[PDB]
Design a protein around this motif. Structure first.
Motif, PDB file in Angstrom:
ATOM      1  N   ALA A  21       1.091  -1.369   0.142  1.00  0.00           N
ATOM      2  CA  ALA A  21      -0.231   0.086  -0.131  1.00  0.00           C
ATOM      3  C   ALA A  21       0.399   1.006   0.014  1.00  0.00           C
ATOM      4  O   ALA A  21       1.690   1.286   0.862  1.00  0.00           O
ATOM      5  CB  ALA A  21      -0.972  -0.072   1.647  1.00  0.00           C
ATOM      6  N   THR A  36      -4.300   2.820   5.056  1.00  0.00           N
ATOM      7  CA  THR A  36      -5.295   1.678   4.253  1.00  0.00           C
ATOM      8  C   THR A  36      -4.769   0.260   5.065  1.00  0.00           C
ATOM      9  O   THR A  36      -5.515  -0.020   5.195  1.00  0.00           O
ATOM     10  CB  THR A  36      -5.108   1.864   2.841  1.00  0.00           C
ATOM     11  OG1 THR A  36      -3.681   1.764   2.869  1.00  0.00           O
ATOM     12  CG2 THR A  36      -4.844   3.155   2.325  1.00  0.00           C
ATOM     13  N   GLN A  38      -6.495   0.592   7.702  1.00  0.00           N
ATOM     14  CA  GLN A  38      -7.841   0.217   8.024  1.00  0.00           C
ATOM     15  C   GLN A  38      -8.627  -1.808   8.019  1.00  0.00           C
ATOM     16  O   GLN A  38      -9.217  -1.968   8.724  1.00  0.00           O
ATOM     17  CB  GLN A  38      -8.966   1.080   6.494  1.00  0.00           C
ATOM     18  CG  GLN A  38      -8.813   1.515   6.575  1.00  0.00           C
ATOM     19  CD  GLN A  38      -8.372   3.160   6.581  1.00  0.00           C
ATOM     20  OE1 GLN A  38      -7.798   3.860   7.548  1.00  0.00           O
ATOM     21  NE2 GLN A  38      -7.974   3.607   5.458  1.00  0.00           N
ATOM     22  N   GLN A  78      -7.396  10.417   1.650  1.00  0.00           N
ATOM     23  CA  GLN A  78      -7.429   9.984   3.098  1.00  0.00           C
ATOM     24  C   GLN A  78      -8.342   9.804   4.400  1.00  0.00           C
ATOM     25  O   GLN A  78      -8.204   8.268   5.187  1.00  0.00           O
ATOM     26  CB  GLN A  78      -5.153  10.244   3.527  1.00  0.00           C
ATOM     27  CG  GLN A  78      -4.621  10.123   1.989  1.00  0.00           C
ATOM     28  CD  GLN A  78      -3.521  11.743   2.573  1.00  0.00           C
ATOM     29  OE1 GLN A  78      -3.885  12.741   3.441  1.00  0.00           O
ATOM     30  NE2 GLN A  78      -2.459  10.974   2.596  1.00  0.00           N
ATOM     31  N   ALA A  90     -11.028   8.132   3.984  1.00  0.00           N
ATOM     32  CA  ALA A  90     -10.947   6.521   3.718  1.00  0.00           C
ATOM     33  C   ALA A  90     -11.155   6.271   5.776  1.00  0.00           C
ATOM     34  O   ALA A  90     -10.790   5.196   5.886  1.00  0.00           O
ATOM     35  CB  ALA A  90      -9.694   6.149   2.704  1.00  0.00           C
ATOM     36  N   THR A 146      -7.683   4.015  -2.758  1.00  0.00           N
ATOM     37  CA  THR A 146      -7.577   3.717  -1.471  1.00  0.00           C
ATOM     38  C   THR A 146      -8.776   2.728  -0.462  1.00  0.00           C
ATOM     39  O   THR A 146      -8.854   2.201   0.168  1.00  0.00           O
ATOM     40  CB  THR A 146      -6.891   4.906  -0.450  1.00  0.00           C
ATOM     41  OG1 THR A 146      -8.131   5.761  -0.828  1.00  0.00           O
ATOM     42  CG2 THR A 146      -5.729   5.263  -0.851  1.00  0.00           C
ATOM     43  N   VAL A 147      -9.606   3.042  -1.215  1.00  0.00           N
ATOM     44  CA  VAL A 147     -11.169   3.516  -0.468  1.00  0.00           C
ATOM     45  C   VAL A 147     -11.673   2.012  -0.920  1.00  0.00           C
ATOM     46  O   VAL A 147     -12.040   1.445  -0.058  1.00  0.00           O
ATOM     47  CB  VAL A 147     -12.083   4.380  -0.865  1.00  0.00           C
ATOM     48  CG1 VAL A 147     -13.247   3.849   0.062  1.00  0.00           C
ATOM     49  CG2 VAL A 147     -11.735   5.639  -0.131  1.00  0.00           C
ATOM     50  N   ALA A 155      -9.419  -1.229   0.558  1.00  0.00           N
ATOM     51  CA  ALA A 155     -10.138  -1.092   1.935  1.00  0.00           C
ATOM     52  C   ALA A 155     -11.458  -1.400   2.451  1.00  0.00           C
ATOM     53  O   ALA A 155     -11.628  -2.607   2.952  1.00  0.00           O
ATOM     54  CB  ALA A 155     -10.044   0.697   2.650  1.00  0.00           C
TER      55      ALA A 155
END
Ligand SMILES: C[C@@H]1CCO[C@H]2Cn3cc(C(=O)NCc4ccc(F)cc4F)c(=O)c(O)c3C(=O)N12
Ligand SMILES: [Mg+2]
Ligand SMILES: [Mg+2]
Lengths: 264, 40, 52, 270, 40, 194, 142, 25
Positions: free
Chosen positions: F105, F110, F113, G40, G43, G70-71, G74
């Motif tokens: 990443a 992230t 997350q 960021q 997220a 990124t989302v 995730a």
DNA sequence: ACTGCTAGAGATTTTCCCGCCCACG
DNA sequence: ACTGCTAGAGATTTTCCCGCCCACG
DNA sequence: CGTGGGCGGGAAAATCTCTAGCA
């Protein structure tokens, strides 16, 4: 019924009679009469500051014995009580007796030492009574209080041969001044005036307690040949077929199917 | 009650509840007009 | 004063006003109307033909 | 929250006002007014307004000692029929009452005694006698004479008839026996017009003839009822059928004496 | 009463007045046959 | 375990201040990163911890991140009592499962997350076999799922009480005042509706 | 509404971008202020939606930050299936009690606590924080 | 004439003309 | 776990009987 | 020619309201 | 897509009944 409101309005414009006259004459509900007397400009007098609690207090020393005299000054009713010793406890006891018999709201007296005790302060705190010292509510009856005391002394000079003790003749004298003194406009002795004043005050304060919850409420309404829900108007009389409201300045009637009453 | 008063005397009182015409003696009567009249 | 209920939700201090108020209203209205309205009713009673 | 509610609370602190007075004087809903009435612990009402129920079972017998002419009288009453016995007591003590109860148990099928909390009815002698005879002892509320109010009324009635019968006898006990004979035989009325002597005979005869006959019946008839209950599709069972109805039968599954309609039921022979 | 008996045990007796099912406890029952049965 | 016990502590990743939190009944990691050692971000995190579930208390250490006037003013504004292990284990096991997604990443948060979700939903075991996010629901939502009496003693007019019920009868009720097991008839006693 | 479904939305106030997340079956909001409107921060908003509370999917608007790579990563290792009135009640409560707020974030905090535990109602005088746990209780106990 | 009240709701002029009609006969 | 109840008097409603008379066979 | 009566508690019947949803404009 | 009416669920209000105590 509903077409007498405008001819009560012009009547209140020309002569400015109160809500009782326009209510009883035009056979109206009294709420629209109180709103007609409310919406006027020059008919807005003073508030309470009338009062059924106009009570004068006066001490005297007859035959070397204390007589405390109370007067219901709104109706001219007067009574008294023989007091053995000058103290605040006796005055508080007599004041609590007067509060137990009649709804005493305000008392007018002087700045006497017996009437300034903290026991009387605790009694009127437990009662909730506005108190005045040396201030007349209106200076008309100011001499009339003394003249009624002299009248009662003349009645004592009549009925001192009617009883042995002082207080028995005092009770006979206040019985005579309650009943054996006629005159006036319609032959009222002393009690019919005070029960008329108390009954009218009870009825108008019941009207105040009735109307003080209605003004919180809202009535959203539409009209006939209309779906535009106007409002929120103010309720006057809730009916079974027709409800009376006022939106901005007009007394309107509406069907109940066109009405919607918010509960708060 | 409450019936409607029709005529008052000294020993008896004529009243009407719904359609009956009652003659109630003076020692049984209660006559008053409520402060609640402002709605009804 | 403070205890409410009874007939119409009032204390006894209001009913003792209302009773005497009806006392010094209704019989005075009756005395005012009894000198004006004076109608003489003749009646034929039941089971009979005599106009009494 | 409202300020009028707080001032009504001050009114409750000073006068303990009614709920309707606070509801009228401040435009309140009645629920919070009744809550403010229930708030202060000085505002406690007079309890509920309903009378209890005294048992009407054939195995129960009431007793009471009463007093008349300076003498003590033992009175016994069968609760289901109203059959009364009475006697004069030499001295109020537990042993003579135990002797009287032994005579009663020897003459009548007595199982349960329900008296008040007197001194003579709490002795060890009546405890030993009821243990010897196998009698269930029961007592009432310690200061409620109303559960014994049947025998209190029967003390009233027997003394009223004693007032009618006192002149024929020289002493108390002869008139007592004559009066209790008069009440147990000559007094006619009540349920079926009879005196209590025929009524207690009817009670004991119906009890025997309607326990032995159902005992002989229940060893033959044995039907197992399955039932699909209401609001549900589960077929539950088996249950013991008490009596077959016309559109709804009565059964007992485990402990519930219940009614099941025959369309929602299914009866099996074994 | 008088209801018809349906089943008897010791604790409770079930009866029927017209169509009801009354599960009356033993402390409230009254099981007597009125001896004016000689007509009905 | 109480239905509203939570525990707050801190961690320094590269000298960087994060605030971790755990429910003692489940051991349930939540966390927030703060830009500097301040108290406004702490009250921010406290009422965002209350932002979906009701919170009864917060357990802390004896540091100066709980003795300031901002966080105490916020917690006494909301009504949460303040008082200054079960967090020190999972705070050590919060830095371990980043390794599947750290170099995979661009941004490390992230990986935070994905790691906090792989701790939240895909962690089971033991007796109940539920996830921790469902274990806390089971505990608190099984924790989510008693009258007075007064009486007039006979041969007397004085009313007494209150007492607690023992067994209901249709003619008389048995009650305990403090230790007095007494039976009083319903015509002489009266039960409060609540 | 399934008890694993939540909803997101955004707002701007006093030069600061705030984001709200609600549980659709209950209606208790949670807002958070971010310095810069970057992917960021949203997220991390997905983190402070998902990592404690029992989520299944996501629900937001057509912003490019809400659907970034990124989302999506995730949601890839967070199992979230990306599919697709929550602000006005918060904007009512913040302005009445702005006076106890040295920053806007504390006003957001005290406003969502007023929405939490100072407005009782429903069927037993409950909170929304009890209703969300009752509905996800029905989910976990069915 | 615009202010009334009392037992019968009388004014002053109607009351005094009633008492004058009483006093004449 | 425990519990108000029962005998008598007008009073009022409900219901056979008889005679009868007016209506019919 | 005199006379039982009155405040409070569940309980039960009677009645608006609201929301809603199924039936209709 | 835009409205109306009965229903049902709940509140709430008027009355029934019934009792405690006045020595
Ligand atoms: C010395 C005078 C001379 C005359 O006789 C005594 C006796 N007496 C008795 C009671 C009494 O028992 N009240 C409770 C009560 C019981 C039943 C009922 F139906 C009505 C009730 F009031 C009184 O109240 C009372 O004032 C007197 C009294 O004054 N006197
Ligand atoms: Mg005894
Ligand atoms: Mg006895």
């Amino acid at each position: 019924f509903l077409d007498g409101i405008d001819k009560a309005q012009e009547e209140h414009e020309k002569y400015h009679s109160n809500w009782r006259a326009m209510a009883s004459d035009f056979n109206l509900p009294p709420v629209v009469a109180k709103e007609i007397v409310a919406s006027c400009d020059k008919c807005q007098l003073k508030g309470e500051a009338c009062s059924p609690g106009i009570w004068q207090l006066d001490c005297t020393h007859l035959e070397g014995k204390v007589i405390l005299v109370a007067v219901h000054v709104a109706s001219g009713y007067i009574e008294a009580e023989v007091i053995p010793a000058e103290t605040g406890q006796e005055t508080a006891y007599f004041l609590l007796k007067l509060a137990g018999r009649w709804p005493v709201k305000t008392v007018h007296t002087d700045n006497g030492s017996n009437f300034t005790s903290t026991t009387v302060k605790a009694a009127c705190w437990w009662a909730g009574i506005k108190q005045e010292f040396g201030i007349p509510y209106n200076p008309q009856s100011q001499g009339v209080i003394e003249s009624m005391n002299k009248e009662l002394k003349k009645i004592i000079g009549q009925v001192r041969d009617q009883a042995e003790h002082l207080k028995t003749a005092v009770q006979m004298a206040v019985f005579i001044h309650n009943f054996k003194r006629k005159g006036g406009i319609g032959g009222y002795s002393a009690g019919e005036r005070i029960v008329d004043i108390i009954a009218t005050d009870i009825q108008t304060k019941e009207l105040q307690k009735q109307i003080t919850k209605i003004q919180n409420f809202r009535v959203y309404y539409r009209d006939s040949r209309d779906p535009v829900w106007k409002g929120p108007a103010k309720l006057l009389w809730k009916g079974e077929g027709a409800v009376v409201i006022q939106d901005n300045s007009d007394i309107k009637v509406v069907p109940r199917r066109k009405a919607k009453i918010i509960r708060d | 009650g409450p019936a409607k008063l029709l005529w008052k005397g000294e020993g008896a009182v004529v009243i009407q509840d719904n359609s009956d015409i009652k003659v109630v003696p003076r020692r049984k009567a209660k006559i008053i007009r409520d402060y609640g009249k402002q709605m009804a």
